[PDB]
Symmetry: C2
Subunit: 663 residues, 2 copies
Amino acid sequence: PTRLSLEAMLAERAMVARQDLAGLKRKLAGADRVLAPQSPEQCGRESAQAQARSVTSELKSAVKEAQGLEHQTLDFLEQLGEYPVCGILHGDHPVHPSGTHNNNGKVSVKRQFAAGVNTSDALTCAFRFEDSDLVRETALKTTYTDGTWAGFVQRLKMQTTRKCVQEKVSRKLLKQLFPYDPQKLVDVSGELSELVLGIKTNAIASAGPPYWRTKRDALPDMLDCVLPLLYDHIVRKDLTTLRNKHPELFLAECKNKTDRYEVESLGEKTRPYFSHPFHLSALVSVLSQSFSGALKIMTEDSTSFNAYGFSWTNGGAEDLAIWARQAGEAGKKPPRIACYGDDTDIYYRKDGKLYRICPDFKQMDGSVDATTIEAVVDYVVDAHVKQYPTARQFWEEVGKLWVEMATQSPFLIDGTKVYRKMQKDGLMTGVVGTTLFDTVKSALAYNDWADQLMFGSLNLLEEKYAIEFFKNKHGLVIKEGTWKPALVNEDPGFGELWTEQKFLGLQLKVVRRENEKVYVPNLPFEDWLTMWVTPRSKYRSKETETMRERTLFDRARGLLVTGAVFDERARGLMGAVINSTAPEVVCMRVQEGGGRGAPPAYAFLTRDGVFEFPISDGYPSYDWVVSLYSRDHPCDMPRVFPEAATLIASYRKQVMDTRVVIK
Amino acid sequence: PTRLSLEAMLAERAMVARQDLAGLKRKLAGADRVLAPQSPEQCGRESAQAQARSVTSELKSAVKEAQGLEHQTLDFLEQLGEYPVCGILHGDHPVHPSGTHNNNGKVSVKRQFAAGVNTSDALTCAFRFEDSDLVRETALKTTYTDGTWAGFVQRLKMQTTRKCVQEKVSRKLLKQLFPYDPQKLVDVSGELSELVLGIKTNAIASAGPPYWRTKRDALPDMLDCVLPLLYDHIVRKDLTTLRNKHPELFLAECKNKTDRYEVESLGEKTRPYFSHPFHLSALVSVLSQSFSGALKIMTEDSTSFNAYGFSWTNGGAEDLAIWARQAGEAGKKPPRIACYGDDTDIYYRKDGKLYRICPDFKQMDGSVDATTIEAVVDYVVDAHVKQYPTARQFWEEVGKLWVEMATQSPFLIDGTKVYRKMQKDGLMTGVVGTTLFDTVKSALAYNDWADQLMFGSLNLLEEKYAIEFFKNKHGLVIKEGTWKPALVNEDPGFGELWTEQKFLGLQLKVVRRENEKVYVPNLPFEDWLTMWVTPRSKYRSKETETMRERTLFDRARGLLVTGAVFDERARGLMGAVINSTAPEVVCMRVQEGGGRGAPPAYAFLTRDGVFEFPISDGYPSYDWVVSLYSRDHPCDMPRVFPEAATLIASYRKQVMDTRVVIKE
């Protein structure tokens, strides 16, 4: 015969074998397994499950009670009446699907505040392998929920009614604070379809009005129909006509963010965000994603305040330390200030000693003034049109759309009533460029702060005067008790911390590799525990037992990589989960991460955002994780089952020499 | 956000969309469709179905009657008693599966002679678009069937009891008739596992005893367990111990070949073939597939009698004609002789005129003498060990196994009785190297025939003396009426034939392409029709209407590429089928052919055997097929729906300039 080679035949066999769970279970039985250093079992199977259910039951009652609270009026917003449903057709169907988001010809939405909380699987594991009291107390503080109406409206009010301060800012200043590589900018003078096809986004996210579908679902309608229509009115300078005739094309949706929330403040705090039309966000994303890819970060340019793009792996963690040590005496030499969104890392020296500040902004978006927003858009647009002047006028028009989306977009909340922010001031969270808008506003305030240090106002190192400064001079609210300068351990020993403070949600720590120091992320056990027992996903009954077991395995690998392996208790807990995962679940074919397993949830491991596990049946050992954060003495990801490949293929090669003598 | 690009998002939609038939049907509803040349409809669906069921009913009845006939005794074979079931274990399971092929501890088989007949879907199409009488009488002539017990035993007896003539053959003569490229030989001095993993075979073919499973199912058992055991006994020269302990490791199975058979002779003709153990055939395949890849063909070396490797596309068809014209005057200069297994093409000149002979051997495997078989194995082994002398002893041992497999393997037929061919003479059809063994035996015969012409015996050009010659001097049986010399049209005009004879099942034709001649394969309409209405697949229970419609589409393309496009009537029928195929079926994602659609059944289009369509939603037009058989002037395969991609994606790119001036 001659159809396919035996080698190819073996390969095909291997591929279908990893989809046969019963086959994997049989063949991997009694196989040599790499076991993690796990914590001892603390209670039986049934006990752990019952304790987890008790917590879940209590959290569900707290959510239900808080969701029962009445919410304030929305009178703090301007009301615009009702919008007609978009009647634009694309071939054989309307872009606005019939029988959805339609109340008698008017666009409508309904906010969902479900009673269901996060799954109990991870919490069960916590009770199984850790202290009952600590697990219970930790789990009862936080829950993954839709939030509440009362907390939603309260938080919405806070960021749409705050008195802002217009920043004193120019292009020249932004060039100093946010340098970039012009050669990294996308050629926006190219054809628009190709540019739009280049932007990246969440395929599962809402495409907003008028699509009312996921982005991947609405993608042809956006590209083939609405976008050319939008383009035609832009270049003819006829947007008002399009706005007036098809208002849903410029309509946003104000949604409640499903998230981890503090139980005690459920009725006062639920974060709003705005979902804009797909065509608008995608068009603007050309500039926004181009610019963010060209931005220098602080560790590359000491004049930069920008942390937007910083990542921990590949020496990133140590780069932070090296950069921070360059901080000078307050009032004599420049400090070291890092801005990523509303998160800030400040370093200064006092009498030669390095101090670190990590303060929190309170609802920063409500403090972002219209001047800053316009200045950022102008800066981003100018950066491109200086590089590619032949396309200036088109992208300056897009810039105007951008500013409107960030400040004055009409939006739905619940029902048919259309609202609008009373003032331009205040950033509409969720708009494209949100992180940059926040980063610049923060950097501008901290730049002024640093200038006042050089002016001689050294009492701005103190919380009371610092908080007053940011409020009065920049309209920013620093949470009381979060401005606490800490003495930095500039050259930490093995197992020692940088400080106890967090930047981008993580502590900085030094661990041992051979005789060299490696800077790695770190958290207290209870912080790892909180993340672990509150996964960001609801109860789905379609999820089979196998999928749920695999999820625990993937999330455990995720936390370890993020730095849980560097905390002994967290290491032992994640180790228990891994060791408890069945062989067939470890070695089965998975879809997530391109067949390599779901990537960690933490978003700042790499700059491009995407972290890839080498293999889906891989074990995140201490040595391997350390290798991820060092500039490299590289390491393979060890397999949980070293003999998995041969056992699954039911064949291990043995050398058979043809050159042997016989007679 | 940021997860994947809109471009990648679009491509991901495109993949999903071609798997959604309901969506395809909708989005391709009013699409511009390019139609192939077609014959008009001759009757309605219900009429075609009724006529199709009528024919099928008669064929089933004829098969049942023929299968009812009693068969001869099998005492013409040696009886070896019964073999014990192999008890070799591979980990947690036996290599010979429990509860299968086991009659009280003894190996057993059961021949399958079912009354099942090929599907009637293709036959229905024929009634729809062609002449009722012609379609009916053509369909009644042949049928795809398991054969009969009577014909099976009769044919087995004929190829195991024929008196053969031992050929006079040396390495020197074989080097003359079958030259090869030594540099193209596989390095058989390398490690054995890598070599064996390199051979190619049919994944769903039987792995034979003791596996009693498909090759892909039994592959780990063979590789990890049996093969190292076989290797160990070979290198220790201890095969006898292995044979005596585990006889099933060397047992073959004699099977009835399911095939297209003439209804007239169902009770007298069912072809037997042998299925050898996978470890033995795979090991031998290392030498055999290496050698066939290194062999020269007639059109590369004018001294070669070898056709084994010839293919029609990319100028191959014209290469045949060019090679054939070199034939000289009979008795003065050498003729042109080409051997492909049991198929031969012979050219000679008389009074300057070019003549062609295409005779048929009657069951050639029965005539393949043991001397020829041993000589071929020796030639193949020597070829490798002369190029790679460090592995000489191992492959010489394999050569001995090869000879045994081809002549003397014990085998089952039906039940537990083990049989063996009485004489060494006679090739056990199905053994690795079958084609080569046949090719050489024929070439040796025709080489001797050619020599006698040079010695002045010109009466051997006549059938009477030719048949006598091949019988008495080489033990070969030329079928009467098949030795018929025909005048060759040496330079055929447009639409004319080389001759009306066939080589490798096809005629040779000249067709027009841009006022230039292209040599192409051809068949008369009835031959294309016969193949069309008799597909090589029984009615299986699981196949949906969609899969059945796609199969019609694929088979129609297959025949067109094979040459049906060059016969107007056959083209019209294939085009009618293609054009009546639903849009969603044409454009849907398919698994066969690497996603390009199932390749043609005809095996000699390319030398590597692998033919692949450019696209799964294209159709074989005249211009494209001609481009395949020409050396150059290639062509794009035309799409049935030119706008399919944009329609399915629901997106057509339009240029939006960012460099426009908006104000002043």
